[PDB]
Amino acid sequence: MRVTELIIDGFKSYAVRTVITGWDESFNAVTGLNGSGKSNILDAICFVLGINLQDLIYKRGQAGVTKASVTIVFDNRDKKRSPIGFEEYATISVTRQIVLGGTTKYLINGHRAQQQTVQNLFQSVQLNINNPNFLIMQGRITKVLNMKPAEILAMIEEAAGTRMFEDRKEKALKTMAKKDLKLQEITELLADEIEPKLEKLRQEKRAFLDFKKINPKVMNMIDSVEKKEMSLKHMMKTVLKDKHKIEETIATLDEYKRKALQETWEKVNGDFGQIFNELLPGSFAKLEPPEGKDLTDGLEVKVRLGKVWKQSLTELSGGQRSLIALSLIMALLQFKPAPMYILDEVDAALDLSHTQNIGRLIKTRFKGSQFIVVSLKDGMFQNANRIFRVRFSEGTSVVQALTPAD
């Protein structure tokens, strides 16, 4: 499902009921540097999705407005991507409301719904509200640029799905820990408790036969502890074989983990360089282990600016660093896909041509997903199919909808 309509009423700078309609299925751009209305559109979308709420009302809500409502209207004609249990609806609308005191209620298609129902709806179409895989904000770019090689790898390990192997390896390690401990309990009991009692007992019997009393049950005590020895010694050789079996299992786990990480590394590395080449024509990039280490020890971003390999991301300009981090983020979207993606103010250091390159990539390489790009600066992302310009007029934010190529 994709967005077709956004209705904001009494929410933040939208004092009056405001309907923003005609959202494109592929590439939308929300602009408006001055004022708060442009960013308020994103806050309204995040509010319905579920990312002191009385402050979100028009005046918190000390002035006239005392109720706030936001409604997202989804097109649901593509039944293949329809949320399960809602296939009959050609259109699904989710509404969230605020009243004084900051309590909220949800509506689905005009009928009251539980919050869990709305959350289960969004997560059924891979809009992970709890861990947003669809929200690319400026902080994510800054975070990626400062990631150490171990953290870059962790990003790749997640896409490879190697937690599968790591959970198994953690189980076997707890198992082999109990096995290892068992031999220590055996060796303590055997060497320090069973073997001394047995040789002392054989010594008493060896004092008695020599030319007086011996314990009548000495024959039995000998045979009793002699059996306990043969049982412990065989357990030694058995628990060790279990320990060997776990080691061979873990090595097979690590091998399949390494091979799965290798396939994901090559897939990401290929897309990452091509995406960066599209966003910054004439340049290239790759993920490579740091000088001297291995894949298991982490991955590192190497950038070729023009014909020059750069030693550090530190050496890149502001715009080049944003494009490098955005290229890596976009190269990983395929592993946790979403029907909708939101790009929030990543264009501070960018030129117009860079935003045009991002826009072309959205319409082609990422065709099949709906992109909403909230621009920071005006006049960016001009090749968007639908552009919503926010201004402020008569105490409320007003949105002008445009369709380039008229």
Q: Which of 128, 59, 66, 65 is nearest to 103 (CA)?
A: 66
* Rounded (to 5) percent helix, strand, coil in the chain: 45, 20, 30
Please enumerate in sequence order all residues whose Cβ is within 8 A of that of 198, keeping only pairs 6 or more positions apart, or say none: 222, 225, 226, 229
Q: Where are the alpha helices (DSSP H) in 209-339?
A: 218-279, 318-331
Find residue 387's DSSP bridge partners.
29, 402
The C-alpha atoms of residue 299 and residue 72 are separated, in whole angstroms, by: 40
- Under DSSP, is residue 399 helix (H, G, I), strand (E, B) or coil? strand
Dihedral sign of CA atoms 331, 332, 337, 338 in order: negative
The CA distances from residue 253 to 23, 116, 156, 391, in Å, are 47, 38, 18, 58
Instruction: Specify the residue for token string 């300009």.
Output: 317
- Give one DSSP letter per residue of 45-79, joined into a string: HHHHHT--GGGGBTTTTSSS---EEEEEEEE---G
Do the Cβ atoms of 20 and 399 come closer than 8 Å? yes
Residue 194, amino acid: I
- Under DSSP, is residue 85 helix (H, G, I), strand (E, B) or coil? coil
The CA distances from residue 208 to 3, 200, 212, 223, 320, in Å, are 97, 13, 7, 17, 93
The C-alpha atoms of residue 192 and residue 94 are separated, in whole angstroms, by: 72
Do the Cβ atoms of 99 and 65 come closer than 8 Å? no
Q: Where are the alpha helices (DSSP H) in 280-392?
A: 318-331, 352-363
Which two three-digit tokens encode residue 206?
């060896």
Please enumerate in sequence order all residues whose Cβ is within 8 A of that of 373, keeping only pairs 6 or more positions apart, or say none: 27, 28, 29, 30, 342, 343, 358, 359, 362, 381, 384
Which two three-digit tokens encode residue 400?
């002008």
Do the Cβ atoms of 264 and 271 come closer than 8 Å? no
Dihedral sign of CA atoms 308, 309, 312, 318 in order: positive
Into which CATH architecture does domain 1-134+339-406 fall? 3-Layer(aba) Sandwich (3.40)
